[PDB]
Structure 1
Amino acid sequence: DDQVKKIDKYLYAMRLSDETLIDIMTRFRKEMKNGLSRDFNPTATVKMLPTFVRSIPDGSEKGDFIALDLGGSSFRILRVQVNHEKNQNVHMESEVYDTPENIVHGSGSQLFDHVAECLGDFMEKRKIKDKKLPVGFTFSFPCQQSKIDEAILITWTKRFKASGVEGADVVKLLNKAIKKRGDYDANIVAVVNDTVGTMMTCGYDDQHCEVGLIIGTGTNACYMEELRHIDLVEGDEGRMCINTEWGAFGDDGSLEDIRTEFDREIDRGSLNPGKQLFEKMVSGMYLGELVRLILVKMAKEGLLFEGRITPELLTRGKFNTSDVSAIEKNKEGLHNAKEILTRLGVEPSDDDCVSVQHVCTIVSFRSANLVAATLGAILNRLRDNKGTPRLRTTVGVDGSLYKTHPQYSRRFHKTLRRLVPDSDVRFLLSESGSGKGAAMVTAVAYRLAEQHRQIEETLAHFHLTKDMLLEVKKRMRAEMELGLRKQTHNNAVVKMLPSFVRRTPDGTENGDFLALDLGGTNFRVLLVKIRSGKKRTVEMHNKIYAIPIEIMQGTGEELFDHIVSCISDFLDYMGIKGPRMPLGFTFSFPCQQTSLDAGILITWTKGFKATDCVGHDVVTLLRDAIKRREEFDLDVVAVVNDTVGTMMTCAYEEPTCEVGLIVGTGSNACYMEEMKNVEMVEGDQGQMCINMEWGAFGDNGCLDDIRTHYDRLVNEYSLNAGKQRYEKMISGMYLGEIVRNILIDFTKKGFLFRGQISETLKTRGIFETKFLSQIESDRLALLQVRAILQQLGLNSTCDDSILVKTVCGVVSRRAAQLCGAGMAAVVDKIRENRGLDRLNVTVGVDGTLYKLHPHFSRIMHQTVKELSPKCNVSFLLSEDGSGKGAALITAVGVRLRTE
């Protein structure tokens, strides 16, 4: 006893009080906060690195993969096999490869070539070198990573010191070595820390695991932290495993008050002086040597061995941590001591043995107590995160020291239970611990890799090549011809109807004109004053009127009676009733023009059911209603198509404009054609603006080779199945539906919304052009995109969001391109029509998709350029082709009945 008491005082500084431990527990808690915070992270010693592991094995894990484990006591290679069974275990085998101490102090190159050399042999000796099995990599060192399969070595720790690796990506470095040999082919799908592997390996057997603890050569702990606490990782949903890297605890001076002269000497003779100061007070790679130093000091003071000092006792590394354990055994502790010490050349006395055994006890007890303190900080942290008064969790443990020291386990648990009282912690030990762990993470990594490989293949069908685009342009052009020729027009799908607008405005237009814009329940009347002065100027007014459904489904005699009623109101509203004014009539329903002022209605749409209108000439129905009133008289000069109105509106300013285009809910285009070509209208002189009605392009199957399964579904479920095939791959009314139908598919395959098909996802037209234009916005953050989706009614996650945005993108790009191939055919036909080799033409466009969408117009333009280089086409957003345009068509109209 006297002896033991003499050591206790000598090593008093190595005997920490609970008061002290709690303090240390508190200091670490602060180091944890700083490392997580984005403000102090820059200069924090406890790195708290994100592992990018968001959950423990859910069981659904299955596969066959390899696993490397480098950085611990020994370098082993495992082949883990997690398969499907009826409550039966998982199989796995491992092999340890000797790694020369002069190899971990060499060049990164030699080291990774060694690891590669050992890998190939392992697979070959098992001849599984053919089936490229996924490879997991457990690397126990602080690594920076922004994804599971990347690992930038922050620095080396423990006994490694290979140059040319720090600051580099070990995965690339390994892939580099595996290549150099080319003996085989490896798939490093993931890189994980050993603490992570341990937590995984044990969480598999216990879904309560949230902490991985390593206590061996080195020491470290990882836990499950709230994303909303990990400032340096964008997100807020779920959890992510954090790699504290607590071995560096104190590397900034925080622990100088508890470190002794022996601790500092141990540091001076170390590979990484000044680093991992806490670790050097705890882990097994240092325990043995720490005791030796204490023994040398004592012999030197004649406190032990009667001052006798031998060359062996002074040689670094002669007293291993394994002697510390042998000496602390309950049974043969003191006998082991005598043997060990004796082997050191010393001649120990019974007193010497007891003393040396108490030094061991004091040194290893400190290790235990210190780790209880820091682990307790992680427990309190978990207790706070869950807001629970008492904590219940399972800790995954591993490490040569913890597993082989006879007293560590017990002392560690005892002290821990005394510092962190309101909690019941379960400690699960693991066989390989990080062997099966890297496998579970690899498993998930592979999984997500296939999902992406698949998703990429599905979206590939939407990728049109410049050659396909040329065919599309080729085919559109042929369709155009069939519709112009008189011999095939009746059977053509791209009708190419004549608008009877023989000239674009020339500036000579001057006057006051009325326009009627009818295309729904809310139509409008307008007054447009045009002054052909020195300076072109046009002012206008307009009021909107409603059409009671009762009248929409009225008798056609009431419909036009009501409309003239509204016009009668407007004229008074503008204070201009009296004179016989000219009026342009924009009729946005399926019509067939037989003259500038005549158009037969082929079918009602948008809810109109007025009787005795279909088949009749709308302009006559209007003229008849006007006369029925006898209050005033108008001179209906024309019936107008809004697309044609859009070009006219544009031509008025930009004279090189001879093409109009609409890309909104629907799509159409027009252009000035040569009369000699309009076989449907007598006269080979002059020009004629043609209203293509190009949305029917492909209605005879000519696009059937570029349409996808989702294009077909959208058609199958559309109201006009088999019709408007082209407009269905380009208009804002369907784009969302192609998108929605892809999402449903992916949801079923389980790549989105947890495989759960939402009711909102089942609703058609949920993805309007407005919301389609947002999700793809450059100025939007993924957290906003996610908000938008959730706002629609989709329980999307940051991850879902990334997916939905990609799909949208794929669909809208093809839309713009397919639109470009179309537009590309028109301009070239115009060029060739006039026998030119270079054409400069402007196009007037309108439409909520072209206008609101972030990338449609751009990609569209890029495309027309590639497919039609002999043409220099310019696109100008021209609005109100239905009002201003109809008026301009009217002004040009009256102007021409004079010539």
Structure 2
Amino acid sequence: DDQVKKIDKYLYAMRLSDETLIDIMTRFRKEMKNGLSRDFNPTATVKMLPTFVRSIPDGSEKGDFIALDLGGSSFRILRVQVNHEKNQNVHMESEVYDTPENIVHGSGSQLFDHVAECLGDFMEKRKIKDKKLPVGFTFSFPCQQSKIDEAILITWTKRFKASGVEGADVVKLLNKAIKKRGDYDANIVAVVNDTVGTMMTCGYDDQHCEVGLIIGTGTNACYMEELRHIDLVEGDEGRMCINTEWGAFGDDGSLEDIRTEFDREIDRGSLNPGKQLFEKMVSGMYLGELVRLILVKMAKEGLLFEGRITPELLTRGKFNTSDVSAIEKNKEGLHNAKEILTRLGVEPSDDDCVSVQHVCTIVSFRSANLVAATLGAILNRLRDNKGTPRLRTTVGVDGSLYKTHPQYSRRFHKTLRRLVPDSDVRFLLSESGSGKGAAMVTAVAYRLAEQHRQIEETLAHFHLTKDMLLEVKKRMRAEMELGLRKQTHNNAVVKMLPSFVRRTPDGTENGDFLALDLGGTNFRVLLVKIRSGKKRTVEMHNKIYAIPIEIMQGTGEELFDHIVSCISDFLDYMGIKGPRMPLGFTFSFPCQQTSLDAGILITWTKGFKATDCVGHDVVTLLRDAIKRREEFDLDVVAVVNDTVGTMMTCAYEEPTCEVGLIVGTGSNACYMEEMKNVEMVEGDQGQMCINMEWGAFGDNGCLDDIRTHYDRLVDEYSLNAGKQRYEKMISGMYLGEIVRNILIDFTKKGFLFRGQISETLKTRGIFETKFLSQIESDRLALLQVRAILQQLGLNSTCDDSILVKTVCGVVSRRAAQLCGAGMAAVVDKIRENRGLDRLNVTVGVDGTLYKLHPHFSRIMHQTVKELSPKCNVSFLLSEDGSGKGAALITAVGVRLRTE
């Protein structure tokens, strides 16, 4: 018995006490916390990688898929088929493909080309090549994943080292491989770790399974962690499977007290020097060589074989874990030992077979013990999570060492239950391998992939290519010409109306003017004082007056009686009622003018529909209302479009400004045109600012080309169906509605809101500019988005919030691009007007959508730059509204009247 109590001392370092195993477990419990926090994760050796698997199979899984299994003992390819509807129990076939050491160590090419070939063959043997079967991929190595169908290899482990893979996405690599073959197609849909696949397999039969264990070639474990603990994944709702990749436990010196002179030597001869230190003490790729190393040490000291030592005993890996498993069976360990030892060359004495069989014991016992130390940590986590004073769960398992060693399973289970007897754990052992669990993953993944495909398909119609954009620009320019020319003018949809403002501020304007601002979100009245000369100044005051919908769509008389009423109030307010003052009337609607002070309303736009206004001169209507009240008398000098007012506001200080843009409730633009081109106004000298009224672009159908189902719905249900189509794809009054329609559709499709169309969601106007701007704010936590959605009355989850945001962006982006296409045409027509190669011009802009939206202006500018590269456009934001420009315009109006 001395022949054994002696070893125990020699290998005494590799005999861990329960006292010790407790410290190990404690440490791994920490490593887990560190691997999960976003602060410490980058340092942690235990990556706790997110797996994107939300729970174990339930039974709803159904379909037919192909699974790949690489990284373990053998490269397998399975085929799982299940459908409880048709009443077809889980069925599955499989095959193995020989993979030479040279492929596992070659280039990713060789490897993945080899994988592609094996998939080709596998499918050629069932002729399922033409079937759109979803592919699953079980990949044993640690991977960075942001989505289930992505796998960026962090680092090879076990037996693989292939160049050009670490840091890449194995999904893209495999897809490339296939492509290069053009022998068939394959829809890779998920990549899972063998652990995760194992947890899934057992879960399928045991709904208590919350863990996945793999003690084979290598060792690793996955478990169901709470989403409120996975810092690296936005969301707390529910749980997600976490791959711990604990093999790297101690890769940073963590276990320098546990590791022995033998672990250090096996490492110095390993493929991955310094890494997977915990694993190199446990898995079956190392146990065999560990034993051999210990036997070489002893032999050199005469403790075995009479200190005999053959070349085979020194050769790497001449001792297999097979032999470590064959030595330990009760019946025949010693008989096997003899044969194994004898083959080596040493002169195996019945004593040697007894000593060697004990070395194996200590080695194999330790591994198991360790895996119990860490597993204990996982369970300790689960119980703590739940809260129950006692944990009850099932642990999946797989891998060759656990499966073949006749003492490992037995011993391990015992040690674990002892370290954490505060729980009743069942050990279900996969038999199918991982395929079942894996395909159970593909099922769900593919299910989600399909939805996503439909989503993307629908949103794809809102994407515009450089060329499509250039086409819009072109169509815009064409419509611009039709509008300017007397012949084609009556039918042209882009009216190109004359403003009768012939020049930007010349710095002589002087005086006190009243102003009106009607058509934007806020109706106001203003007093603007301009003082020219050396020391020039501008002083203004205003006040917002509400207009009740009932009035905003009552009768003409009513509307202007209210307006004039507001004017009276403002006059009292400013303490200036009495005098007869000149007035500029900013009226944001398409008007036919014959002079600066006459403007006949062509048609209502946006939200206004007062009766008996269209066809009238809005200046006449105003004068009438002034006469009716009889309280005071004014000299209405001008009627101005907000575009024009905006351009003048900016021209006041920026003389390079010759363009006006509004992107608010509605959208429109104006620019300085050469009189020779304004065929609708006699004269060919100088210039005139043209109120484009480009919102109507597309009303003749010249855009049906790019309008969508959702665009038509908004148009079709608006106050002015068939009109302002271009605007209806750009401004803040409509974007929200487009979004809302997209969402209603997605909900009927079951992609959102658990497929229930909220009463809120059926309320029109719900997505105001304000909300759209907030939703698309950068780095805006999903938690915040969800917050805003619930605020509107939309009870949404994190996935909902993500989808919604994506939709808002698609719409707001298209809007900026279409707007830019228009401006592109405009600035380019100017460049030509001046026969320039390059043109510098600045645009005066205004509008709530433009001010509030965090992407519009940016994308809009980018677009104008790409579409009209021969122009350098400066967009200057108007901070005081349109009033200064209207006033400057009123001044000139007076110089003409008093002329």
Band the TM-score falls in, shorter-chain normalisation: 0.7 to 0.9
More displaced stretch, 772-781 vs 68-77? 772-781
Work out whether residues 202 and 433 of structure 1, in 8 Å CA contact, stay in contact via their aligned partners in 2.
no
More displaced stretch, 535-544 vs 551-560? 551-560
Residues 795 and 388 of structure 1: is their aligned pair in 2 closer, same or farther, counting only changes over 3 Å? Answer: farther
Question: CA offsets, 1:160-219, max 9 Å, x none?
Answer: 456676566555665666567666665555443221221222233344332110112322
Work out whether residues 36 and 231 of structure 1, in 8 Å CA contact, stay in contact via their aligned partners in 2.
yes
Question: CA offsets, 1:453-475, max 9 Å, x none?
Answer: 44443333223445544554454
Residues 457 and 627 of structure 1: is their aligned pair in 2 closer, same or farther, counting only changes over 3 Å? Answer: closer
Residues 608 and 694 of structure 1: is their aligned pair in 2 closer, same or farther, counting only changes over 3 Å? Answer: closer
Q: Give the distance between the partners of 1:300 and 1:503, measured in 2 at CA.
A: 103
The aligned runs of 1:28-43 (5 Å cut-off) are 28-38=28-38, 40-43=40-43
Give the corresponding residue for 2:449. 449
Give the corresponding residue for 2:295. 295
Residues 635 and 391 of structure 1: is their aligned pair in 2 closer, same or farther, counting only changes over 3 Å? Answer: same
Q: Give the distance between the partners of 1:258 and 1:5, measured in 2 at CA.
A: 21
Residues 8 and 167 of structure 1: is their aligned pair in 2 closer, same or farther, counting only changes over 3 Å? Answer: same
Question: CA offsets, 1:720-775, max 9 Å, x none?
Answer: 22222222112221112222222333344444445454444333222222332344
Work out whether residues 642 and 885 of structure 1, in 8 Å CA contact, stay in contact via their aligned partners in 2.
no
Work out whether residues 221 and 246 of structure 1, in 8 Å CA contact, stay in contact via their aligned partners in 2.
yes
Following superposition, the deviation at residue 802 of structure 1 comes to: 4.6
Q: Secondary structure at the match of 2:93?
A: strand
Aligned length: 899
Work out whether residues 645 and 885 of structure 2, in 8 Å CA contact, stay in contact via their aligned partners in 1.
yes
Work out whether residues 521 and 552 of structure 1, in 8 Å CA contact, stay in contact via their aligned partners in 2.
no
Residues 61 and 644 of structure 1: is their aligned pair in 2 closer, same or farther, counting only changes over 3 Å? Answer: same
Following superposition, the deviation at residue 777 of structure 1 comes to: 4.0
Following superposition, the deviation at residue 18 of structure 1 comes to: 3.0
Residues 282 and 548 of structure 1: is their aligned pair in 2 closer, same or farther, counting only changes over 3 Å? Answer: closer
Following superposition, the deviation at residue 529 of structure 1 comes to: 1.9
Residues 557 and 138 of structure 1: is their aligned pair in 2 closer, same or farther, counting only changes over 3 Å? Answer: closer
Residues 501 and 208 of structure 1: is their aligned pair in 2 closer, same or farther, counting only changes over 3 Å? Answer: same
Residues 51 and 833 of structure 1: is their aligned pair in 2 closer, same or farther, counting only changes over 3 Å? Answer: closer
Work out whether residues 601 and 613 of structure 2, in 8 Å CA contact, stay in contact via their aligned partners in 1.
yes
Following superposition, the deviation at residue 296 of structure 1 comes to: 7.0
Work out whether residues 649 and 879 of structure 1, in 8 Å CA contact, stay in contact via their aligned partners in 2.
no
Work out whether residues 643 and 881 of structure 1, in 8 Å CA contact, stay in contact via their aligned partners in 2.
no
The aligned runs of 1:667-706 (5 Å cut-off) are 667-672=667-672, 689-706=689-706
Residues 29 and 829 of structure 1: is their aligned pair in 2 closer, same or farther, counting only changes over 3 Å? Answer: closer
Work out whether residues 65 and 80 of structure 2, in 8 Å CA contact, stay in contact via their aligned partners in 1.
yes
Work out whether residues 671 and 826 of structure 1, in 8 Å CA contact, stay in contact via their aligned partners in 2.
yes
Following superposition, the deviation at residue 378 of structure 1 comes to: 0.8
More displaced stretch, 496-505 vs 724-733? 496-505
Work out whether residues 134 and 188 of structure 2, in 8 Å CA contact, stay in contact via their aligned partners in 1.
yes
Residues 488 and 290 of structure 1: is their aligned pair in 2 closer, same or farther, counting only changes over 3 Å? Answer: closer
Question: CA offsets, 1:353-374, max 9 Å, x none?
Answer: 7776666555444433332222
Q: Give the distance between the partners of 1:726 and 1:669, measured in 2 at CA.
A: 12
Q: Give the distance between the partners of 1:292 and 1:475, measured in 2 at CA.
A: 81
Work out whether residues 646 and 880 of structure 1, in 8 Å CA contact, stay in contact via their aligned partners in 2.
no
Q: Give the distance between the partners of 2:878 and 2:358, measured in 1 at CA.
A: 92
Give the corresponding residue for 1:415. 415
Q: Give the distance between the partners of 1:214 and 1:764, measured in 2 at CA.
A: 55
Residues 670 and 429 of structure 1: is their aligned pair in 2 closer, same or farther, counting only changes over 3 Å? Answer: same
More displaced stretch, 697-706 vs 461-470? 461-470
Question: CA offsets, 1:518-537, max 9 Å, x none?
Answer: 45997443322222213432
Following superposition, the deviation at residue 711 of structure 1 comes to: 0.9
Work out whether residues 203 and 210 of structure 1, in 8 Å CA contact, stay in contact via their aligned partners in 2.
yes
More displaced stretch, 292-301 vs 806-815? 292-301
Q: Secondary structure at the match of 1:324?
A: helix
Residues 896 and 752 of structure 1: is their aligned pair in 2 closer, same or farther, counting only changes over 3 Å? Answer: same
Question: CA offsets, 1:475-518, max 9 Å, x none?
Answer: 44555566566677665544454445455543332222222344
Residues 532 and 186 of structure 1: is their aligned pair in 2 closer, same or farther, counting only changes over 3 Å? Answer: same
Give the corresponding residue for 1:232. 232
More displaced stretch, 667-676 vs 882-891? 667-676
More displaced stretch, 744-753 vs 611-620? 611-620
Q: Give the distance between the partners of 1:540 and 1:67, measured in 2 at CA.
A: 73
Task: Report the identity percentage.
Answer: 100
Residues 686 and 314 of structure 1: is their aligned pair in 2 closer, same or farther, counting only changes over 3 Å? Answer: closer
Residues 302 and 749 of structure 1: is their aligned pair in 2 closer, same or farther, counting only changes over 3 Å? Answer: same
Work out whether residues 647 and 881 of structure 1, in 8 Å CA contact, stay in contact via their aligned partners in 2.
no
More displaced stretch, 662-671 vs 708-717? 662-671
Give the corresponding residue for 1:816. 816
Give the corresponding residue for 2:884. 884
Residues 651 and 386 of structure 1: is their aligned pair in 2 closer, same or farther, counting only changes over 3 Å? Answer: same
Q: Give the distance between the partners of 1:695 and 1:402, measured in 2 at CA.
A: 72
Q: Give the distance between the partners of 2:861 and 2:11, measured in 1 at CA.
A: 81
Give the corresponding residue for 1:483. 483
Q: Give the distance between the partners of 1:595 and 1:398, measured in 2 at CA.
A: 88
Q: Secondary structure at the match of 1:636?
A: strand
Following superposition, the deviation at residue 716 of structure 1 comes to: 1.9
Q: Give the distance between the partners of 1:485 and 1:25, measured in 2 at CA.
A: 85
Following superposition, the deviation at residue 387 of structure 1 comes to: 2.9
Question: CA offsets, 1:239-274, max 9 Å, x none?
Answer: 443332333434555545555666666656655565
Question: CA offsets, 1:635-681, max 9 Å, x none?
Answer: 23234433333333334444454543322101233445566766766
Residues 842 and 117 of structure 1: is their aligned pair in 2 closer, same or farther, counting only changes over 3 Å? Answer: closer
Following superposition, the deviation at residue 822 of structure 1 comes to: 3.5
Residues 577 and 782 of structure 1: is their aligned pair in 2 closer, same or farther, counting only changes over 3 Å? Answer: same
Give the corresponding residue for 2:147. 147
Following superposition, the deviation at residue 383 of structure 1 comes to: 1.6
Give the corresponding residue for 1:785. 785
Work out whether residues 150 and 169 of structure 1, in 8 Å CA contact, stay in contact via their aligned partners in 2.
yes
Q: Give the distance between the partners of 2:850 and 2:627, measured in 1 at CA.
A: 41
Q: Give the distance between the partners of 2:264 and 2:677, measured in 1 at CA.
A: 97
Following superposition, the deviation at residue 388 of structure 1 comes to: 2.9
Question: Where does the alignment leave 5 or more consecutive residues of structure 1 unmatched?
Answer: none
Residues 562 and 758 of structure 1: is their aligned pair in 2 closer, same or farther, counting only changes over 3 Å? Answer: closer
Larger Rg: 1
Question: Where does the alignment leave 5 or more consecutive residues of structure 2 unmatched?
Answer: none
Residues 356 and 501 of structure 1: is their aligned pair in 2 closer, same or farther, counting only changes over 3 Å? Answer: closer
More displaced stretch, 108-117 vs 828-837? 828-837
Q: Give the distance between the partners of 2:168 and 2:213, measured in 1 at CA.
A: 26
Residues 439 and 895 of structure 1: is their aligned pair in 2 closer, same or farther, counting only changes over 3 Å? Answer: same
Following superposition, the deviation at residue 80 of structure 1 comes to: 3.4
More displaced stretch, 175-184 vs 506-515? 175-184
Q: Give the distance between the partners of 1:726 and 1:766, measured in 2 at CA.
A: 21
Give the corresponding residue for 2:304. 304
Work out whether residues 590 and 693 of structure 2, in 8 Å CA contact, stay in contact via their aligned partners in 1.
no
Following superposition, the deviation at residue 86 of structure 1 comes to: 4.1
Residues 53 and 671 of structure 1: is their aligned pair in 2 closer, same or farther, counting only changes over 3 Å? Answer: same
Q: Secondary structure at the match of 2:473?
A: helix
Work out whether residues 739 and 811 of structure 1, in 8 Å CA contact, stay in contact via their aligned partners in 2.
yes
Q: Secondary structure at the match of 1:79?
A: strand
Residues 583 and 65 of structure 1: is their aligned pair in 2 closer, same or farther, counting only changes over 3 Å? Answer: same
More displaced stretch, 506-515 vs 133-142? 133-142
Residues 641 and 14 of structure 1: is their aligned pair in 2 closer, same or farther, counting only changes over 3 Å? Answer: closer
Residues 728 and 687 of structure 1: is their aligned pair in 2 closer, same or farther, counting only changes over 3 Å? Answer: same
More displaced stretch, 349-358 vs 461-470? 349-358
Following superposition, the deviation at residue 379 of structure 1 comes to: 0.5
Question: CA offsets, 1:800-840, max 9 Å, x none?
Answer: 45544443333233323333443455556667778888876
Q: Give the distance between the partners of 2:164 and 2:647, measured in 1 at CA.
A: 66
Following superposition, the deviation at residue 712 of structure 1 comes to: 0.7
TM-score (norm 2): 0.85
Residues 580 and 240 of structure 1: is their aligned pair in 2 closer, same or farther, counting only changes over 3 Å? Answer: same
Q: Give the distance between the partners of 1:190 and 1:611, measured in 2 at CA.
A: 61
Work out whether residues 66 and 80 of structure 1, in 8 Å CA contact, stay in contact via their aligned partners in 2.
yes
Residues 85 and 536 of structure 1: is their aligned pair in 2 closer, same or farther, counting only changes over 3 Å? Answer: same
Give the corresponding residue for 2:354. 354
The CA RMSD measured in Å over matched residues stands at 4.5
Q: Give the distance between the partners of 1:601 and 1:848, measured in 2 at CA.
A: 24
Q: Secondary structure at the match of 1:167?
A: coil
